[PDB]
Design a protein around this ligand. Structure first.
Ligand code: MG
Ligand code: MG
Lengths: 640, 158, 333, 422, 27, 49
RNA sequence: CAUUGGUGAGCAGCGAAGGAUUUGGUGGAUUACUAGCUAAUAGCAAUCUAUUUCAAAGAAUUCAAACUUGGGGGAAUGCCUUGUUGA
């Protein structure tokens, strides 16, 4: 499983995996700790810049996160890890197989709740010790005492008490002596979330049927009762800027705000996060600022701000609605295609099943930006025919880019599923282009290619017709008709003289682009599926249907190498920049690196999830892959 | 009137001066060590200086009435009755969606002089000066041609 | 940034000069911007001349005089590389010092260089005017403080008040006390009437960049981002020595009267608002005024300076002050 | 931000300091009785002397004004300055000013009020500090000459910029523009808060209610096409209706009757909101004139119901409440008058409620059906319920008579219901 | 003119927060 | 504690009546009036001139 | 006859609960992502400042110090250099 050429580097474009993020304050500034699968990333609240990432991937997925000043605690399976600046400092291993579920830190005690309704307490060996390390005791809540534990919370000014919140009711445990001081009355509806209020002795409890309860622990009595019919609360948070507001999140993806003093609704922010992916998984007010941070399972983190009231008087009543301030995001579903935008490793294009194309920056996370799909106005003056409701373009099956004429006109071609034309994009503008290329044979787009000079775009139809358009004007110029089945690959050499095509018929044709003549025709044994053309070396590799990669020398039109060993389809493959290796992925959950000079497999890997795509950097430093699971991109460093 | 009483708080005895932050809690400079009950009571005051006590917690509690209308507004978010349940259509707004055109499957070469929907089956009949009778099977997504019938020299008006 | 601030003698106008070259003259109370230059040059300090109508700016190599609206009026070719500026109001002289170690006095009324003096002590590090006698105090890199008058080619008095360069100097209104700070992390309060050292706070946490004295007598100190104020420090009795902390509540020790911390900013200059209880602070991100009760003179005298002066009063005062200009020669200890 | 922008904010804060003479001239020049040149010449003592007399005349008209003699119009108030006071003190002054603007809201036509408010404009600069409360109180006098003067001396807040044109303009603001000012939602919340204060103090008067009603009705009309805005309007304006209905004063309730009806026609609503509306309307219904307006409102609301159960019987609590405030004799009188509005759906619901809850009124059913012609679907529902009654309730002369009525008119429908039921 | 609705720049401000470290006590 | 600041009543120092003279406060502290001898000297010289 | 002149009145064609032009505000980027403050080998982040002082170290005959001037001719009174008189 361990490659001798490649090693994992990071995941790009993943901002949050749905686990509630944790907020920690260093002096004035605030930072946000977010979960990304098996690692966590720390973001600065002011600019949402990436600051730190955990050095190593945890053995099991992170479940809960709590941050306290420099130190960050991440809980995976039965182990609770302490991290400083993304460097593990110490590991708290619990003595039971039960997985930790919730995590609370107040003062020198650390509380970890396992799924077996057992609460472990750790303490600091010394009063000035930075983090708790020693094992103090173990408290367990039985089913008679209360139901499953929903969350562990600590209220201010409670000496060595932990407010355990259960589905049935709320309990108060004195960790120092491990005795149950108080059990709250039973609550009819299952509890889902808890939140300590800025007021004293009052903790906000979110139920499964749209109730929020300001339960007073000291008095053991309800104070207030909100109703949100037909909803499930997922998060709660109070505003500490001096105005008595409450933000209530819902699983449906809607965030509501109430003015407790006035008993009224300020506003509702609708569908801030997709309902499908868990909606508002976490929504927290920053301590003493008008800004509220929200996250969700759709791989997005957002921030909203409450502007000052416009009314010189009675500012309390006239409340501006919240305003989008800033955000960072990524794909909601695994990327389908990737490609390197630049000769350097700066920018990456990614297209996903979520019908969105993104530009990801390897050098910095902030630079990552989405390609807007707003269409340019038609030159003819005719009205563009489309549904009034705006819907994103279908996913991108194939893509091609060039940088010879960046900034002058469109330089990207993309094909869509079940769509009879290919759309253009402009990298410099980061916006869809003004040309659409039609196959002209009632066939769907299966291949897209561009000349090196950036002037010609080739579109391969499923009915065997290859069309050539001009990128700067989008006017059809020529059309080649050789294949009788779908063409699955097109490429043009660096000199723009010799052109090569391949189709499901298993035939490879050699065309002379300048004179428009068929130089020669080659038939292979099996249908061809994909093609990569290496312009420097004039070798191109075909992923045949018999689980073979065939290298052919365009100048001479002969098979030079044939690679065997794959146990299943070849989903994707790429050439090394120098023209010496081919890295191919297959459905047998492997990535094999093939040495073209010797024609044998020199390295092999077994990935847990099949790799849909593999792409070398033109420099040769990095190798990126996308997989059937995971919203991000795995980046690898070429140890060679 | 506290529901519960914690005895460990009456015995616990904490020093103040060890940490800088707690130093504010002293009442007199001689004082250096206090039992728990006063430590909690002092912590309560400092907490208030951080987050002032708002109006809603203290003065107000929930614990034919005139305020019926204001209540029902609070619970409901959607103030417009669902049109799915009602069996009259709304007056000014039409909820209308386009489908695939019926004639895409087999085009007409002359104007569509008449249209008709079969009483029970899902069929549509078209005619024109093309002198043809085209019957289409309207599904809304494909709309293929069931049959066609050419009537030589009989321009179709209806 | 950073921004150097100077207030008008009557407290009606504020002059700020960004280091990279944004000079702005404004009436801060009523929020009217009189002038705003965006000189693409380095400006070091600026001062208001006889009234708010004219101000001077010390640019990269020359000093320039400007009008109320921002028109330059003169380019002072003689003053080379001036770093600090001061204006003697009764005498109508503009004073300069800089990297040349030359003290140049220029009369604004006649436009003639009254006298130019050779300091012979390398670049000048600090400067302040004694309001009582209009004798100029220069610090130097050798740790001495020298007193100069236009009529004397040699310094009147030389005081050794530090072990390294003197970063700043301040003189009270009465012209009786002087506060000097050095690069040796030491503050020294001087009695300039008799030239006897009163206090020496030998060890400071960090070097003090600037010092200032209010009308009421508050001593102000700035150390990088910190700003600290002491009350009754300027006095002969021993108990008035500035102290940062009282040991066990000893009443005699003089703890700070007020303190403030600009988190990430290095203070550039401190200037009291003349007749209001406010302290101006220049720093990297702009200008800030702190509220310092008791700082300023509550009871101003309208004949001499008047914050509520109308334009007709301003022009009448501009002449009668010009008529009885004290000759430059009259300056003496 | 640029240096100029920040200094502008400093100027706006420092508007009323009167730093120099020129500033003192502009501030002192603003007036509601006098021109600029005379205004500059006057002194606070002369201005206060007129106000003290003017307040006395207002006191005779209304005793409540006499209280401000102890606070705002006292001889000590001459020496009182706002710029010199602390933050806590200015709030008490603002509260005193806001209370006075409420009392003077209804007496702007009288001459003395214009003198009395001059003292506040000159001494306390309400035209600069309490700008919002002054405009809100005098919004309904928009065509009056007094309102023109207010605009000239006042700097408009951000919410009132619709009037920016009409400052120092010969034409007074038109009726159409006032709809624009109310159209923005933010103003409605502001006006709602001011209106709420009036109800709490019972300071309302007919003219304010008339003008407040006319704007709110028009705002709905201007938003008839845009459904999504109308949805945002319901939380605000219906909330006002609940407050107006709480008021004891009848004219306040009648305004709630106007405003409720227009939404019901403007936007279809859920029955629960409609039913909730009835209970609020009927809780405080004591005045006869409000009582007449209520009954028309109740009937109009049900007509807007266009869903299943549109003619379902009222809930039991609602039925008992309705009969208490409207005996059977009253509704028969309402059914009598030839110019009645269409009320068939309510009578169908009110009809079925009797059969479920009140047996002894079953005779009244006969009278009610004769007076009004009900729709065929409504009649079918009545027949269906009465059929169940006969099976359960003991057979009565009135009960059979009600059938006998249905025998006479549309006999065939009677069989259809019987065929489907029995 | 209609009401101008401008998005004023919002920058962070210092706010005091209660620290739980004072809470834990040892006998 | 007890905080007090230099506090100017603008009405005292800028008259309300546009016709009225402006107030002229006066402080005789010598610290506010430096160069007592030199100023009187020039006023003697100018009187002679 | 021609307008690749202006201003309009209408078609053909394009055409999913509208289309087109202009504009204010904010947010993210425009260099390659190791967190805030301070008296910084650690504290604070609720600050302490009732230990923040003492001790130790620390002063070139460099006792030099315009490298900073638009050209020509001078410079009473100044200032620089040199010598001199008398204390
Ligand atoms: Mg714009
Ligand atoms: Mg010369």
């Amino acid at each position: 499983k361990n490659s001798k050429i490649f090693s994992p580097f990071r995941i790009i474009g993943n901002v949050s995996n749905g686990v509630p993020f944790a907020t920690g304050t260093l002096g004035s500034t605030f930072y946000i700790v977010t979960c990304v699968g098996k690692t966590f990333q720390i973001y600065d609240a002011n600019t949402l810049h990436l600051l730190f990432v955990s050095e190593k991937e945890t053995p099991s997925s992170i479940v809960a996160l709590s941050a306290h000043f420099h130190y960050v605690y991440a809980a995976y399976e039965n182990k609770v890890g302490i991290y400083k600046r993304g460097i593990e400092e110490h590991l708290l291993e619990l003595e039971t197989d039960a997985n930790v579920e919730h995590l609370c830190i107040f003062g020198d005690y650390l509380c970890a709740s396992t799924d077996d309704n057992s609460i472990f307490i750790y303490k600091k060996s010394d009063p000035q010790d930075k983090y708790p390390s020693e094992f103090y005791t173990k408290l367990t809540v039985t089913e008679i005492q209360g139901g499953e534990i929903v969350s562990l919370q600590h209220l201010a000014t409670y000496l060595n008490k932990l407010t355990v919140v259960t589905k049935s009711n709320v309990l108060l445990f004195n960790v120092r002596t491990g005795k149950l001081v108080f059990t709250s009355n039973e609550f009819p509806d299952q509890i889902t979330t808890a939140e300590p209020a800025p007021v004293l002795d009052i903790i906000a409890l979110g139920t499964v049927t749209g109730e929020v309860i300001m339960f007073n622990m000291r008095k053991g009595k309800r104070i207030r009762t909100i109703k949100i019919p037909q909803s499930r609360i997922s998060s709660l948070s109070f505003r500490t800027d001096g105005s008595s507001h409450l933000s209530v999140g819902t699983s449906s993806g809607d965030l509501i705000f109430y003015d407790l003093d006035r008993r009224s609704r300020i506003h509702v922010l609708k569908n801030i996060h997709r309902e499908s992916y868990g909606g508002v998984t976490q929504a927290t007010f920053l301590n003493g600022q008008p800004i509220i941070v929200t996250s969700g399972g759709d791989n997005s983190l957002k921030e909203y701000v409450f502007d000052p009231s416009l009314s010189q008087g009675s500012g309390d009543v006239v409340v501006q609605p919240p305003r989008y301030l800033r955000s960072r995001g990524g794909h909601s579903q695994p990327p389908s295609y990737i490609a390197f935008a630049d000769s350097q490793s700066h920018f990456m294009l990614s297209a996903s099943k979520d019908r969105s194309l993104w530009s990801f920056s390897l050098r910095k996370d902030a630079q990552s930006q989405e390609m807007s799909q707003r269409l340019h106005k038609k030159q003819d003056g005719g009205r563009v025919g489309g549904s009034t409701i705006k819907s994103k373009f279908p996913e991108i099956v194939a893509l091609a880019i060039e940088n010879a004429r960046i900034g002058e006109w469109e330089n990207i071609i993309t094909a869509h599923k079940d769509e009879k034309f290919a759309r253009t994009w402009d990298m410099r503008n980061k916006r869809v282009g003004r040309w659409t290329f039609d196959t002209t044979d009632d066939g769907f787009v299966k291949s897209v290619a561009m000349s090196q000079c950036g002037n010609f775009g080739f579109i391969g139809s499923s009915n065997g017709s290859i069309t050539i358009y001009n990128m700067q004007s989008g006017i059809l110029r020529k059309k080649y008709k050789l294949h009788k089945r779908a063409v699955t690959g097109i490429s043009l050499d660096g000199m723009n003289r010799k052109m090569v095509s391949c189709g499901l018929d298993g035939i490879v044709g050699f065309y002379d682009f300048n004179k428009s003549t068929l130089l020669g025709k080659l038939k292979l044994d099996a249908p061809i599926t994909a093609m990569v053309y290496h312009r420097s070396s004039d070798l191109f590799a075909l992923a045949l249907d018999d689980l073979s990669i065939v290298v052919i020398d365009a100048v001479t039109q002969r098979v030079v190498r044939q690679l065997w060993g794959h146990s299943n389809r070849i989903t994707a493959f790429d050439f090394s920049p120098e023209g010496r290796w081919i890295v191919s992925a297959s459905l047998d959950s492997t990535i094999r690196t093939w040495d073209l000079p010797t024609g044998g497999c020199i390295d092999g890997i077994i990935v847990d999830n099949v790799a849909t795509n593999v792409k070398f950097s033109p420099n040769g430093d990095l190798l990126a892959t996308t997989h059937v699971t995971g919203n991000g991109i795995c980046i690898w460093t070429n140890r060679a | 009137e506290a529901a519960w009483i914690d005895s460990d708080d009456e015995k616990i005895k904490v020093p103040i001066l060890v940490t800088n932050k707690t130093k504010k809690l002293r009442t007199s400079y001689n004082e250096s060590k206090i039992n728990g009950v006063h430590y909690i009571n002092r912590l309560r005051s400092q907490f208030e200086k951080i987050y002032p006590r708002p109006k809603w917690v203290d003065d107000e509690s929930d614990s034919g009435d005139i305020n019926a209308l204001t209540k029902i507004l609070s619970t409901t978010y959607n103030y417009k009755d669902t049109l799915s349940n009602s069996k009259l259509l709304p007056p000014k707004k039409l909820d209308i969606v386009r489908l695939k055109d019926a004639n895409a499957s087999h085009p007409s070469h002359s104007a569509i002089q008449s249209l008709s929907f079969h009483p029970s089956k899902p069929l549509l009949l078209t005619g024109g000066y093309d002198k043809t009778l085209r019957i289409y099977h309207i599904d809304g997504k494909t709309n293929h041609l069931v049959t066609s019938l050419h009537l030589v020299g009989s321009p179709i008006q209806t | 940034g950073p921004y150097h601030i100077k207030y008008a003698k009557n407290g009606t106008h504020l002059l700020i000069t960004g280091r990279k070259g944004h000079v702005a003259s404004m009436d801060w109370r009523k929020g009217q911007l009189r002038a705003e230059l965006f000189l693409n040059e380095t400006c070091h300090s600026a001062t208001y001349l006889q009234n708010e109508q004219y101000f001077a700016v010390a640019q990269k190599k020359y000093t320039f005089i400007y009008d109320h609206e921002g028109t330059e009026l003169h380019r002072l070719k003689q003053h080379i590389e001036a770093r600090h500026l001061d204006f003697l109001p009764y005498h109508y002289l503009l004073v300069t010092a800089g990297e040349t170690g030359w003290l140049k006095y220029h009369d604004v009324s006649t436009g003639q260089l009254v006298s130019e003096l050779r300091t012979k002590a390398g670049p000048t590090m600090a400067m302040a005017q004694n309001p009582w006698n209009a004798v100029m105090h220069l610090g130097h890199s050798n740790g001495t403080v020298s007193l100069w008058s236009p009529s004397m080619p040699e310094p009147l008095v030389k005081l050794l008040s530090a072990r390294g360069p003197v970063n700043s100097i301040a003189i009270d209104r009465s012209g009786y006390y002087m506060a000097t700070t050095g690069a040796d992390r030491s503050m020294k309060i001087w009695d300039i009437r008799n030239f006897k050292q009163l206090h020496s706070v030998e060890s400071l946490p960090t070097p003090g960049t600037n010092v200032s004295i209010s009308d009421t007598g508050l001593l102000a100190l700035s150390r990088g981002p910190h700003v600290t104020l002491w009350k009754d420090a300027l006095k002969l009795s021993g108990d008035s020595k500035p102290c940062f902390g009282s040991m066990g509540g000893n009443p005699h020790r003089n703890t700070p009267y007020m303190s403030h911390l600009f988190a990430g900013n290095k203070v550039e200059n401190l200037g009291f608002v003349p007749f209001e209880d406010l302290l101006g602070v220049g720093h990297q991100t702009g200008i800030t005024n702190l509220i310092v009760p008791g700082a300023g003179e509550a009871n101003y005298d309208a004949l001499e300076l008047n914050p509520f002066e109308t334009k007709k009063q301003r022009q009448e005062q501009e002449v009668r002050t010009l008529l009885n200009k004290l000759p430059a020669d009259t300056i003496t200890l | 931000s640029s240096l100029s922008d920040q200094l502008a904010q400093v100027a706006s804060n420092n508007a009323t300091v009167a730093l120099d003479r020129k500033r003192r001239q502009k501030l002192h020049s603003a007036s509601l009785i006098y021109n600029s040149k005379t205004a500059a010449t006057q002194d606070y003592d002369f201005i206060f002397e007129n106000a003290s007399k003017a307040l006395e005349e207002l006191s005779q008209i209304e005793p409540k004004f006499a209280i401000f003699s102890r606070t705002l119009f006292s001889e000590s108030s001459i020496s009182l300055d706002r710029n010199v006071q602390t933050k806590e003190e200015i709030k008490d002054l603002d509260n005193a000013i806001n209370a006075y603007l409420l009392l003077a809201s209804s007496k702007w036509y009288l001459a003395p009020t214009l003198h009395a408010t001059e003292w506040l404009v000159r001494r306390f600069q309400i035209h600069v500090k309490n700008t919002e409360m002054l405009l809100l109180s005098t919004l309904n006098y928009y065509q009056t000459p007094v309102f023109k003067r207010i605009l000239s001396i006042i700097k408009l807040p951000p919410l009132f910029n619709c009037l920016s044109n009409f400052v120092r303009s010969e034409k007074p603001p038109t009726a159409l523009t006032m709809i624009k000012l109310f159209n923005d939602m933010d103003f409605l919340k502001l006006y709602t808060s001011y209106l709420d204060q009036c109800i709490k103090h019972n300071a309302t008067y007919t003219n304010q209610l008339l003008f407040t009603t006319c704007c709110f009705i028009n705002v709905v009309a201007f938003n008839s096409n845009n459904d999504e805005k109308l949805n945002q309007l319901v939380p605000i304006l219906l909330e006002i209706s609940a407050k107006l209905l709480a008021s004891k004063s009848k004219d306040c309730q009648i305004a709630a009757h106007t405003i409720l009806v227009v939404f019901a026609t403007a936007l279809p609503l859920k029955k629960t909101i409609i039913l909730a509306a009835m209970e609020t309307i009927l809780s405080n219904l004591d005045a006869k004139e409000a009582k007449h307006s209520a009954l028309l409102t109740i009937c109009k609301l049900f007509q807007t119901l266009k869903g299943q159960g549109n003619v379902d019987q009222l809930p039991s609590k609602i039925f008992k409440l309705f009969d208490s405030k409207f005996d059977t004799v009253s509704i028969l009188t309402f059914l009598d008058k030839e110019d009645k509005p269409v009320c068939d759906k309510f009578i169908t619901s009110y009809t079925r409620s009797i059969a479920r809850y009140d047996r002894s009124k079953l005779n009244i059913i006969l009278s009610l059906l004769k007076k009004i012609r009900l729709e065929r679907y409504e009649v079918r529902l009545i027949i269906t319920d009465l059929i169940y009654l006969s099976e359960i309730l003991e057979d009565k002369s009135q009960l059979v008579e009600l059938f006998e009525y249905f025998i006479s008119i549309n006999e065939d429908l009677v069989l259809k219901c019987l065929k489907s039921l029995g | 003119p209609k009401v101008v609705r401008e998005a004023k720049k919002v920058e962070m401000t210092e706010a005091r927060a209660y620290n739980a470290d004072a809470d834990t006590a040892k006998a | 504690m007890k905080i007090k600041t230099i506090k100017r009543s603008a009405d005292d120092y800028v008259p309300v009546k546009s016709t009225q003279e402006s107030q002229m406060p006066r402080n005789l502290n010598p610290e506010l009036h430096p160069f007592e001898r030199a100023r009187e000297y020039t006023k003697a010289l100018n009187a002679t001139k």
